[model samples]
Target: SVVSIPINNAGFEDPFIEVVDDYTVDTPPGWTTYNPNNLVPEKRTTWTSNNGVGYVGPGTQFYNQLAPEGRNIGYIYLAQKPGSGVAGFEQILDATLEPDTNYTLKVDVGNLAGTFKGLSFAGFPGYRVELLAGDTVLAADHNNLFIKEGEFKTSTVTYTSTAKDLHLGQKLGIRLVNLLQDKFSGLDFDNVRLTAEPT
Candidate 1:
């Protein structure tokens, strides 16, 4: 049976498979305000779920000096810097994954404004999700990676292996991380499902 994780569900089997405690009127639950590195706040530009269904951020300005607190400022934060990247899954899961059997993780990717550098974390979205079978990673790491403002796109990536030191029955972890960027744009996410594919 395929497992579909709803944005409103709580307590998943995998400890690493966790979502944000609550969803803002605008942004989704798993997403938090990316505020790190003492940079500017995405909120400075402002954000709104005023209408629900989606989030609206920053009003006509890139680096506005005269911006509102929660508005002009930036939110939708990402995972911590030092803890993001390759080892991103370290803090999101427990239990060994089944090998040989193919696993797929899929999600709806939303707004992204240079969150992959241009001021954000040192690398991509800094978010990583994957399947682990035995000590080997039988899947690719996934992150909410996107570019361009006011643009939303769905992204799907697969990894067929984990770190070289992975044990045969190593635990698998799923993590939604954020990185410090000039501003992480708002995105809307709906259904997230998982399936078991054939090798």
Candidate 2:
């Protein structure tokens, strides 16, 4: 029960979906957004190289090593910030299963830390999800990171579909992209899931 492709067309045939119920689908339909500086926030406080992910800023913070303890890490929807510092840190979730059908990409992260004025950035509390198909990276999870904060940890992954070329359809995404370490920052995220396969 998830599908998104067109944006601007906002769903195209019926986009703009927000299920946040059974599991969580806060936004759908290509999930369009490019806040160059609109002050968007799934979770951001203060930072510099801001693609946006809770913000910690100092030198080279990768969301406080992914998550050390900052609101338990709660939001990220696609950020690369190509400039002074932030190299990459993404989060994309757009579902539209078809070829073969069978998916499961759950989420429930926790609190993280901050301060990236040491080197490049070393905030890796725990987080990893890459099931690409369009660029090529068919599924991955580094030891299933994602932990600490107050409990409520659920990450179920069971994919069995194909066609996105590799991940162009954006089956699911969460990248730390080019981490170095110095003065990174916190990490947090809420319930995010994807379960499809049938029909």
Candidate 3:
């Protein structure tokens, strides 16, 4: 029998991405933010949830949509300089994962076909996901791809852990990295899940 593993805020449903009163583009709860170049606090570039974040980038109205599985989705912005402004989503698994067991990572990715400051197809949304044990990567898949606007593609990768390079604590980690570097672009993501199969 297949068993579903637990990942907090897997669909980005908690801490509510947005409300009519309160507003901000923040790192989703249960996930860590990354802006490796130490940019300004406001430009620290992390995943933003919900469609109301139009005030963030240039022009107006980024045109965000509902979550692929829930009330919201998350994304990273693309800057003008290639590989300059970076963003990432990372979560340390709340449940223990046994070593030597088979597991699969699943999530949906999309690009922004919308305009960004008058430039068409400004969103690249290059996507990558990795399974890590502390700083060590157990498995990773970076198809080096970007999908069409309003289009979503599901991605999956199976991983079997081993004694070597395994986490001593048996804790699992999920990391989502945005590889898009085009000006005024965005990367879309939602409905993330992981499962452990009887092995």
Candidate 4:
């Protein structure tokens, strides 16, 4: 039998602040944002959840299609100076890993190609989706999906746990990472999901 795990604000719908001409820099309800360096406050990374159909700047539209799940989608802005560091958001789910089961995690990723507030988002900044048990990475999608600009593509990560797996019964978690350091680049995400089935 297959079981669907619950993820709080899985579609980035909560704390819905409609962004028409500007964006709001704040964390979503169920996830925590991370930055590369604690010393550089000005160059810290940030995240936002906004209306997918809103305008980016004076006369430019942000997203073309509706969000994959709901009206809102999550966005991550990577730090510009720290060229080697990655930043994004993460959430530790209430569900725990089980032995002798196969698990799948899916997320919708988007590459923004529009101009927002004079910032031209030209190319994909790259992204990584990680599925974890406790602190161990069980599966990951490391920028393997080819998503065009203004399009949302689903990236999936799968993991199978045996009876003798080390992280059995530990809390399952999801982490979305931005792998680029462009000042005008960002990655969009929505509809995060996880499921498990007995083997």
Best by TM-score: 4
Write candidate 2's Cα lDDT for 54-167 as tens digits.
Answer: 322233223223222222223332233322232233444454335666655554454333333554323443444444444445555543654543333555555576554344
lDDT of 3 by residue, 41-79 (tens): 453433432221211122214434434565555665544
**Pairing residues by index, what is the TM-score of model 4?**
0.84
Which model, 1 or 4, shows the larger TM-score?
Answer: 4
Error of 1 at 164 (Å): 13
- TM-score, structure 1 vs. true: 0.41
Alpha-carbon lDDT of model 3: 0.61
lDDT of 4: 0.74
User: What is each predicted model's overall lDDT from 0 to 1?
Assistant: 0.34, 0.37, 0.61, 0.74
Summed backbone clashes in each candidate are 42, 44, 0, 0
Model 2: CA > 4 A from native: 1-37, 40-46, 49-96, 99-102, 113-152, 155-199
2 or 4, which is superior by TM-score?
Answer: 4
Worst 10 residues of 4 by lDDT: 49-58
Candidate 1, residue 130: lDDT: 42
Q: Rank the candidates by lDDT, best first.
A: 4, 3, 2, 1
**Residue 148 of model 1: what lDDT?**
38
